[PDB]
Amino acid sequence: SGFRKMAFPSGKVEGCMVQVTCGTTTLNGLWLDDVVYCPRHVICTSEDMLNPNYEDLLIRKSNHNFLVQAGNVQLRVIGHSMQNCVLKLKVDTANPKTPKYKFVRIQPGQTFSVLACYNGSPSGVYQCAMRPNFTIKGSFLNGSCGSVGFNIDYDCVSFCYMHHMELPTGVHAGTDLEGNFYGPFVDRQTAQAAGTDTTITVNVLAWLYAAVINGDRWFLNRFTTTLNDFNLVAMKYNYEPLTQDHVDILGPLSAQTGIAVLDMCASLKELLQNGMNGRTILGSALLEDEFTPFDVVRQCSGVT
Amino acid sequence: SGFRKMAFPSGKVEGCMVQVTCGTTTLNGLWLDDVVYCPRHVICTSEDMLNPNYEDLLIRKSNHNFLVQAGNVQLRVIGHSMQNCVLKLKVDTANPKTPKYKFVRIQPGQTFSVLACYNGSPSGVYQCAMRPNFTIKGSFLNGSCGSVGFNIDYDCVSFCYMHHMELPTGVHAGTDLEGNFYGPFVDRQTAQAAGTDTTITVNVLAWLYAAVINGDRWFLNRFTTTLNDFNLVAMKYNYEPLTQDHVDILGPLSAQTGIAVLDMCASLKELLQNGMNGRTILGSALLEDEFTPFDVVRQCSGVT
Ligand SMILES: COc1ccccc1OC1CN(C(=O)c2cc(=O)[nH]c3ccccc23)C1
Numbered sequence: 209s210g211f212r213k214m215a216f217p218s219g220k221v222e223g224c225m226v227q228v229t230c231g232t233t234t235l236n237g238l239w240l241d242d243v244v245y246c247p248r249h250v251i252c253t254s255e256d257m258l259n260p261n262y263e264d265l266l267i268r269k270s271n272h273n274f275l276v277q278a279g280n281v282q283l284r285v286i287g288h289s290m291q292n293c294v295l296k297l298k299v300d301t302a303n304p305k306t307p308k309y310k311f312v313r314i315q316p317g318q319t320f321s322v323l324a325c326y327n328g329s330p331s332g333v334y335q336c337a338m339r340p341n342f343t344i345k346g347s348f349l350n351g352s353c354g355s356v357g358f359n360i361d362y363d364c365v366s367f368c369y370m371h372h373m374e375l376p377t378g379v380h381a382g383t384d385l386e387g388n389f390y391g392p393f394v395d396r397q398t399a400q401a402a403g404t405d406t407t408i409t410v411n412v413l414a415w416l417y418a419a420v421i422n423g424d425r426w427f428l429n430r431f432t433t434t435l436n437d438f439n440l441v442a443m444k445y446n447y448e449p450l451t452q453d454h455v456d457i458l459g460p461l462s463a464q465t466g467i468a469v470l471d472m473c474a475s476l477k478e479l480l481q482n483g484m485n486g487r488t489i490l491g492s493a494l495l496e497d498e499f500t501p502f503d504v505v506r507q508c509s510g511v512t
Numbered sequence: 513s514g515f516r517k518m519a520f521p522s523g524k525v526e527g528c529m530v531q532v533t534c535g536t537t538t539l540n541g542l543w544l545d546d547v548v549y550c551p552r553h554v555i556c557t558s559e560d561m562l563n564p565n566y567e568d569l570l571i572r573k574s575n576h577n578f579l580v581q582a583g584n585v586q587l588r589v590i591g592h593s594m595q596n597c598v599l600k601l602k603v604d605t606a607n608p609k610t611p612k613y614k615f616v617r618i619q620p621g622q623t624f625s626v627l628a629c630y631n632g633s634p635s636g637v638y639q640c641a642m643r644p645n646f647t648i649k650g651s652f653l654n655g656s657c658g659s660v661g662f663n664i665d666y667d668c669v670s671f672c673y674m675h676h677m678e679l680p681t682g683v684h685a686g687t688d689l690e691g692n693f694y695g696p697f698v699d700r701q702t703a704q705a706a707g708t709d710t711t712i713t714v715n716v717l718a719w720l721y722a723a724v725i726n727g728d729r730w731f732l733n734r735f736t737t738t739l740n741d742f743n744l745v746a747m748k749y750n751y752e753p754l755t756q757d758h759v760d761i762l763g764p765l766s767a768q769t770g771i772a773v774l775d776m777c778a779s780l781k782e783l784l785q786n787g788m789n790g791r792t793i794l795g796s797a798l799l800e801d802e803f804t805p806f807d808v809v810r811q812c813s814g815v816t
């Protein structure tokens with residue numbers, strides 16, 4: 209029993225973190241096989257970030273200008289290329305600690321673990337979600353760029369995020385490992401405002417199922433609803449519309465608890481309309497939306 | 513910017529997790545040097561747990577009855593001993609991945625990371641705190657015993673917790689790595705109820721400082737208070753009394769924000785008396801108490 213915001217064990221990813229320095233800029237790189245991936249803004253000065261022409265800036269850089277250090281040892285850079293917003297630095301040594309890995313591009317609502325790093329050294333691990341506005345609510349300071357987001361399926365690490373920037377509102381933007389930003393964000397110091405940060409309805413419902421599994425049942429009511437009726441309420445509360453795909457995804461949690469998905473929707477509808485009344489659910493006074501249905505099943509079953 | 517419930521990178525501890533089986537019971541062990549530490553209840557059947565005489569049960573066990581497996585490979589047990597509520601299984605091979613380590617006994621209010629494991633394999637990592645009633649609010653299922661809690665200071669892992677049991681209320685109890693339970697708990701299936709789970713005041717204040725550092729400042733007010741006046745309110749709200757030692761510990765956060773500790777106490781006093789009014793602080797609708805002042809400084813400075 210108990211339900212925590214749990215991250216994947218970070219060891220497999222710690223073994224991939226390196227420091228990348230270009231000129232006076234130092235950030236993190238991800239070393240997989242003989243390639244080190246890092247944000248292309250490592251080549252920029254603070255003045256360059258206002259309106260950078262990455263292709264032009266990159267012309268002034270040679271392999272020897274990219275200093276890559278894995279622990280206390282230097283890696284030899286034998287090639288470099290830009291792929292979208294990431295640089296790929298080919299090194300002469302394959303990372304001996306390279307885990308089985310995939311590069312995946314996640315959809316909003318999906319969760320992942322972040323290993324926050326500074327100077328190629330891991331500082332902490334936390335769980336977050338790709339928000340519906342394509343930002344993440346992370347915890348990143350100066351030097352954190354190049355820190356990665358990932359999921360683990362037994363022994364395969366699926367990298368889904370590389371950290372690039374922080375918007376003025378304190379939220380974060382980054383790319384997949386192909387260098388494509390999530391959402392409309394660009395690696396420039398310009399006016400970039402995030403859209404509405406809607407609540408991930410399917411994740412809230414999964415977390416309500418986790419609450420029932422873990423004994424918190426005060427919010428269960430005598431009502432039901434329809435997808436259309438629920439969605440009228442969801443729209444009013446800036447929640448994402450619930451689809452039949454989401455209902456199907458909640459099937460296993462509905463089966464485990466014996467609570468029909470639409471009955472849980474009616475409980476969530478009442479919580480939205482009436483509030484919590486000073487009560488808590490799984491130690492939270494708000495409806496938590498950064499646990500997917502897969503996360504709830506995983507945590508409640510003990511997948512290693 | 514941003515503030516997350518962050519755990520330490522778990523790699524150093526993943527390298528220590530093994531599976532320990534005695535008879536039909538399987539749980540986790542911690543392999544450091546040539547010793548594997550695990551809960552002594554690995555020798556019990558479910559019927560034994562009602563009123564176990566561990567010394568008597570242990571007489572029926574020999575080294576060859578303790579099956580220790582590190583990954584897919586078996587470790588040879590050449591000795592065994594009971595120290596309080598843990599067993600120490602001496603193996604013939606030192607763990608090659610043994611990090612620099614210490615065994616520490618933490619005080620209530622202190623936080624640590626837990627690497628939840630099943631069958632010697634890590635499943636997830638989360639952050640928690642030793643509660644003032646000596647329970648932890650973890651996330652543990654069948655087979656999680658022997659999972660450990662730790663802190664990391666650069667390259668030294670200070671192990672502080674080993675998981676032993678879950679109380680009927682869904683909260684957890686365990687020992688330090690010397691086998692002494694935190695609090696009054698015993699490794700028996702008997703009526704053991706937890707005491708008042710008071711709020712760790714000094715941690716709430718640290719988290720309010722984190723909120724100011726990260727831009728959430730709506731709760732700052734025009735008032736101040738004294739330690740004695742604040743403590744009258746703290747007692748009423750089941751908060752731990754704030755001492756001058758706690759005020760001194762908050763000194764660096766007070767210096768960083770320019771907000772005197774007693775002024776922050778007055779803001780916390782108003783939040784307790786008036787509530788949040790549907791507002792949030794660092795994405796929470798309740799006052800968070802599982803970040804110590806050291807955690808706040810660490811997260812806000814980027815210690816690796
Ligand atoms: C002027 O630099 C940029 C401007 C616009 C875009 C990118 C720029 O650079 C990169 C951003 N980054 C950081 O280190 C960083 C990332 C972060 O998430 N939080 C921070 C908090 C405080 C100070 C820095 C950061 C480098």
Ligand SMILES: COc1ccccc1OC1CN(C(=O)c2cc(=O)[nH]c3ccccc23)C1
Nearest residue numbers: 209558561652653654655656677678700701
């Ligand atoms: C009957 O066993 C005990 C009774 C009293 C005391 C100890 C007993 O054993 C040990 C407890 N433990 C577990 O695996 C466990 C630990 C946990 O934190 N959560 C659980 C949830 C569901 C099922 C089991 C657990 C073994």
